[PDB]
Amino acid sequence: GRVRTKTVKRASKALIERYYPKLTLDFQTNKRLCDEIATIQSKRLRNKIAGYTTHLMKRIQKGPVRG
Amino acid sequence: ALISKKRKLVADGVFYAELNEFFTRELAEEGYSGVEVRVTPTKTEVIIRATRTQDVLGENGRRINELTLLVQKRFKYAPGTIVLYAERVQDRGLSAVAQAESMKFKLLNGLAIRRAAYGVVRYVMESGAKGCEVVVSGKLRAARAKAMKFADGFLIHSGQPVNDFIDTATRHVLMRQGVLGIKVKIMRDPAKSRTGPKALPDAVTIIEPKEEEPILAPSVKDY
Amino acid sequence: MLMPKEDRNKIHQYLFQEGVVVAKKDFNQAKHEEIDTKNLYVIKALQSLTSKGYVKTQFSWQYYYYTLTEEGVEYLREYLNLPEHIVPATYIQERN
Amino acid sequence: GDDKKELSAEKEAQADAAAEIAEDAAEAEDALQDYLNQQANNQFNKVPEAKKVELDA
Amino acid sequence: QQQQIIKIRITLTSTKVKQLENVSSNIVKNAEQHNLVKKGPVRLPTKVLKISTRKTPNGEGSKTWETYEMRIHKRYIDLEAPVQIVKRITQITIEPGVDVEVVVASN
RNA sequence: ACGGAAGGGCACCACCAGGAGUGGAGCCUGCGGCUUAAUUUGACUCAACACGGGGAAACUCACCAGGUCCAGACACAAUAAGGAUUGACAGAUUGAGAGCUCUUUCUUGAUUUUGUGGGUGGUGGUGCAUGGCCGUUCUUAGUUGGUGGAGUGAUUUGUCUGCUUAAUUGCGAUAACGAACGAGACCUUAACCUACUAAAUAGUGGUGCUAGCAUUUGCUGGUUAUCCACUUCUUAGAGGGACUAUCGGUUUCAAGCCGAUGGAAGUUUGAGGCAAUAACAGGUCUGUGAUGCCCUUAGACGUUCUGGGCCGCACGCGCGCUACACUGACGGAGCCAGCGAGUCUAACCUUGGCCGAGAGGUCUUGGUAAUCUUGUGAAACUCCGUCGUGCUGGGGAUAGAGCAUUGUAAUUAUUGCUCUUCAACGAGGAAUUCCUAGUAAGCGCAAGUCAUCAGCUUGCGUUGAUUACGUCCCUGCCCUUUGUACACACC
Ligand SMILES: [Mg+2]
Ligand SMILES: [Mg+2]
Ligand SMILES: [Mg+2]
Ligand SMILES: [Mg+2]
Ligand SMILES: [Mg+2]
Ligand SMILES: [Mg+2]
Ligand SMILES: [Mg+2]
Ligand SMILES: [Mg+2]
Ligand SMILES: [Mg+2]
Ligand SMILES: [Mg+2]
Ligand SMILES: [Mg+2]
Ligand SMILES: [Mg+2]
Ligand SMILES: [Mg+2]
Ligand SMILES: [Mg+2]
Ligand SMILES: [Mg+2]
Ligand SMILES: [Mg+2]
Ligand SMILES: [Mg+2]
Ligand SMILES: [Mg+2]
Ligand SMILES: [Mg+2]
Ligand SMILES: [Mg+2]
Ligand SMILES: [Mg+2]
Ligand SMILES: [Mg+2]
Ligand SMILES: [Mg+2]
Ligand SMILES: [Mg+2]
Ligand SMILES: [Mg+2]
Ligand SMILES: [Mg+2]
Ligand SMILES: [Mg+2]
């Protein structure tokens, strides 16, 4: 299953929380964003986080999401 | 001479293994810990990291002169092709091995069990540890076996950061009744990791934005 | 142990001058590294020398690490009839 | 040790680390018979110390 | 007055890549920084010493097998230098963990 | 905590759908049992039985028949220089060129003897006295604390109907909010880089030097340096790459899930390493100079040496190997891996040259190794033949005779080769194991062990499927609900 752990979800909240101007429905740039803007120890966890912030930003667009 | 490279490094390892044993046996009442081995042009340089170095040096340098002679006469070095050095470990409150050796010396000195172990933690934690832990297995005063957990602070137990961040030690301490096992576990703060990763991989930090005072219809500056 | 006095000298001497002795746990050597006696002769000699104080014994990984003590310093001082302030491994080498 | 006398354990433990810190802080500043071994057998090597004669019949 | 081009080969072996490479990178930048003539760090296959045991000290249990290993990494670099810098290059660049070995010649 | 109550779940150590089997046979191998001088011993549901790395000719070794020695520290006391004690040639003796013992009579010189005390070793007992380690529960998903809510209190809520996940994984519900351990993250390995740094210990193209065949240029080789260039393949440092992306179905349009495109890769990317709290009288004192206490300690339970035994054979059990053939046996012939290892104060990995039918012998030789063995020219496999369904040329047990190698030693046959002998077994009753993709199954090889010995194990690559992609029927476990007079907790 591809259910995302609490850390991934939690951090995707926090990012959209404080960086909606900057960020996009694009993973790649959100990924690079996550670099110059946060500190994640491993490449994997980072795209894990970017991929899911990119999800959330893309569905925020069509109505809000609780959280 | 003339040995294979595979067999050379394997061999090299065993040499250290024997050394660390022999010292651990000899320099217990001097808070021995590890042995950084260091071979050079000219020499091989064993550096003994104890805590009570004057009790390793001895009368104007006598006992280290023994230990060299020892380590020399056995591993068949030529006189002055191998040297020894005392080296006070940087704060013993984070070297499990030193902390284990304590509880041994503690318990062995008729110290209350909860007292020894609890204080051992209270000294490690006070030595700026991120967390620490003391198992006492074995059997005391009464026939049955029993064990205890003694832990304060924060530990981790799984994966690679184990390797990086937690010191482990076990030491059998042997009393009038039998033998009980001391196990010590220290968690070092990843913040001060020096030469390594500086956090748990677990960790995600977000840089904190900025109050923006927007507005201001266009305008330009010339230079 | 039972052994001829000459061989006792060889050991006692060598221990005095060196202050330290070693020996692999292996009776049946009949001649050990350095000292010209039977290995069995070496080990038991010190094992006595130890069990009457004088010197300390260590083991680890099969090799008997012999440390002479101050009390035994005076005792070999006796055996080899050599004067107070004689020697042992108590010289700071050259300028080493 | 029973959980009844618990408190005075932790305290005796606390004060134990108070002493462990005391000594660990006051150890941050705190306060020739020669002749040799082979050179006394070489020095007493001026002989006159044996005897020898036999071999006959 | 002295000096003569020697055609040298330093072989670096160890199980501590970071330092191993720290000493290896050190050798090449330093020596080329004062212009020699060389073959750059040659990595021969990292080779992997396995040891495969039973976990049990005794006999009983699910027969769980365990396999330890020790990784021996080995570099070498060829240098042409005078007599001076070579000795200057061997006595330093020292490292507790890296097995430096300096050979010579064309045979 | 437990139930021989109730409702839910999970999983190829469960079934479904199938594959390959074992169970039958011959032998190999463990266990029992019998026998025995002795056949050393641990362990007996999963979680004992090709396990103790347990492949025992000596050793190992613990067992049996016997023979030596003290390596009995130290202290006191005794003997005692008029010699405390030590050794032995020959003979007898003994398995023995053990002065074990004896005769006989030298030697030795304070080292020992004797006695008590105290030690000491022991694969002697105790794993129901312990450490440590390991196995199991566990192919599991659980544990805890701050602030708030309830409660006199132990406590509880958080930590939950539901949905979702491999997961107390999440969404969502919500007197809870927001966190930590564990899961995940992490690490290792296998996949992708014509981008980055390079290579005579890896390799490519050109060129020389050169061979053969064609000749019109061509084609297939030789040549550890004759030079020039490169880094696609090889190697390994550094980065990059993937986040279930894009699109779309689907569901509380929540987490998710399913399909299509793209992609080296989209089942936790495949596979592992690591792994919380807790439980067990699980196993291990026979790994340990880890260890308590008991035992024993000179006609020894110490040690060593000589020989046998662990392999003993009416039979019961388990893991295995090999087969019952025609998708085959045989004989030529093609000819292709990958993980490994290998010799210093030494005889390891071994090419090539002879000799030999073979096993092997012999002379040299390269290698402490990406450099030499080795392109490990491995095996199934592919082809062209022979045989023709007949216990047949399927099968190769048992057995005779011979030649070799290891080793001080090969008898009870270490193993190897040759001739001959040619058994059962014609697909296996009740039962029962394992498994979902480069997997199963077939097939070899390297490493462990190892003087010699793999029908074992650990990894490896080669060939390469059929059937699922579901469920709760069987079994196992997990969870709530519930009863308890259990709490040393249904032993
Ligand atoms: Mg993990
Ligand atoms: Mg079925
Ligand atoms: Mg069947
Ligand atoms: Mg025997
Ligand atoms: Mg006595
Ligand atoms: Mg037990
Ligand atoms: Mg145990
Ligand atoms: Mg028993
Ligand atoms: Mg499975
Ligand atoms: Mg209240
Ligand atoms: Mg609950
Ligand atoms: Mg964690
Ligand atoms: Mg490349
Ligand atoms: Mg496709
Ligand atoms: Mg039991
Ligand atoms: Mg044990
Ligand atoms: Mg023992
Ligand atoms: Mg057996
Ligand atoms: Mg089995
Ligand atoms: Mg046949
Ligand atoms: Mg064929
Ligand atoms: Mg012939
Ligand atoms: Mg040679
Ligand atoms: Mg036939
Ligand atoms: Mg083998
Ligand atoms: Mg076996
Ligand atoms: Mg109740």
Side-chain angles (χ1 to χ4, degrees), chain A residues 37-41, chain B residues 203-207:
Chain A
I37 205 212
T39 67
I40 295 166
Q41 314 305 319
Chain B
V204 165
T205 250
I206 312 278
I207 214 65

Side-chain angles (χ1 to χ4, degrees), chain A residues 13-56:
Chain A
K13 181 200 197 287
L15 274 188
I16 298 186
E17 254 182 354
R18 56 209 72 196
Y19 286 94
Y20 194 101
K22 297 139 141 76
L23 283 186
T24 28
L25 315 202
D26 181 285
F27 165 69
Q28 237 66 24
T29 108
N30 290 26
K31 145 184 149 192
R32 290 282 140 87
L33 202 150
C34 288
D35 282 14
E36 323 274 316
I37 205 212
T39 67
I40 295 166
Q41 314 305 319
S42 62
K43 202 193 305 175
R44 203 149 102 89
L45 201 214
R46 179 249 284 165
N47 342 284
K48 232 85 150 41
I49 295 184
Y52 191 69
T53 62
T54 311
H55 184 41
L56 300 189

